């Protein structure tokens, strides 16, 4: 019954970039293929006077060589015709960090407690997603009550990613 076509996914209605600024802690995540961010991830969103949006992220990375380091990443977002879907350019302070450009959709958020984000880096010929990433973010590193949980569990199912997220740890590494 429920479709897994990226184009049919709902996103956050009348998304407000400014109530979205501030510190977001990653509590859970579904990784994409390849190299990614491990744990201890925290993002910081800002908006300038022109209504832009940028962000900086920190997290631990395990190099393919099993190096334990802490990435400082930067991303600039470009607006689209849908206030909740952005094109994100990103890079790291250290050149060895991945550079790239990903779709950045705001699935759901209450601006005050939680956020559900998602990116599909590759579409299968059917319109479903072949390689995706999604973050569950919290304003507070102690979490969400049981009722906010229930809402996040439902959006996850809606993105056809239910059961695929792992809890992310925060231990002060970076
Ligand atoms: C900017 C940031 C976003 C996305 C960041 C991404 C998705 C970072 C990826 C970094 C990686 C994947 C580094 C890596 O490239 N890790 C390694 C591993 C091993 C190695 O040898 C080199 C690098 C997002 C959504 C959080 C919030 C908006 C700000």
From Swiss-Prot:
Ligand binding (substrate): 98
Keywords noted in UniProt: Disulfide bond, Methylation, Retinol-binding, Secreted, Transport, Vitamin A
Tissue specificity remark: Detected in blood plasma (at protein level).
Subcellular location as annotated: Secreted
Gene3D superfamilies per the UniProt record, alphabetical: 2.40.128.20
Entry GO terms, CC: extracellular space
Primary location group: secreted
Coiled coil: none
Disulfide-bond pairs as recorded: 4-160, 70-174, 120-129
GO terms, molecular function: retinal binding; retinol binding; retinol transmembrane transporter activity
UniProt xrefs under InterPro entries: Calycin, Lipocalin_ApoD, Lipocalin_CS, Lipocln_cytosolic_FA-bd_dom, Retinol-bd/Purpurin
Signal sequence, start to end: none
Omega-N-methylarginine carried by residues: 121
GO biological process, one term: retinol transport
Entry similarity comment: Belongs to the calycin superfamily. Lipocalin family.
Function field: Retinol-binding protein that mediates retinol transport in blood plasma. Delivers retinol from the liver stores to the peripheral tissues. Transfers the bound all-trans retinol to STRA6, that then facilitates retinol transport across the cell membrane.
Subunit structure as annotated in this protein's UniProt entry: Interacts with TTR. Interaction with TTR prevents its loss by filtration through the kidney glomeruli. Interacts with STRA6.
Name of the protein in its database record: Retinol-binding protein 4
Lineage: Eukaryota, Metazoa, Chordata, Craniata, Vertebrata
């Amino acid at each position: 019954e429920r479709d897994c076509r990226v184009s049919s996914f709902r996103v956050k209605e009348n998304f407000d970039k400014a109530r979205f600024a501030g510190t977001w802690y990653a509590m859970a995540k579904k990784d994409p293929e390849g190299l990614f961010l491990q744990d201890n991830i925290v993002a910081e969103f800002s908006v300038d006077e022109n209504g832009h949006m940028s962000a900086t992220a920190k997290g631990r990375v395990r190099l393919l060589n099993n190096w334990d380091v802490c990435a400082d990443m930067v991303g600039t977002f470009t607006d689209t015709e849908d206030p909740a879907k952005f094109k994100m350019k990103y890079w790291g302070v250290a050149s060895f960090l991945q550079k790239g450009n990903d779709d950045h959709w705001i699935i759901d958020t209450d601006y005050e407690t939680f956020a559900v984000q998602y990116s599909c880096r590759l579409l299968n010929l059917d319109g479903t997603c072949a390689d995706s990433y999604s973050f569950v973010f919290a304003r507070d590193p102690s979490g969400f009550s049981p009722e906010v949980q229930k809402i996040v569990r439902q959006r996850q199912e809606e993105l056809c990613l239910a059961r695929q997220y792992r809890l992310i740890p925060h231990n002060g590494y970076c």
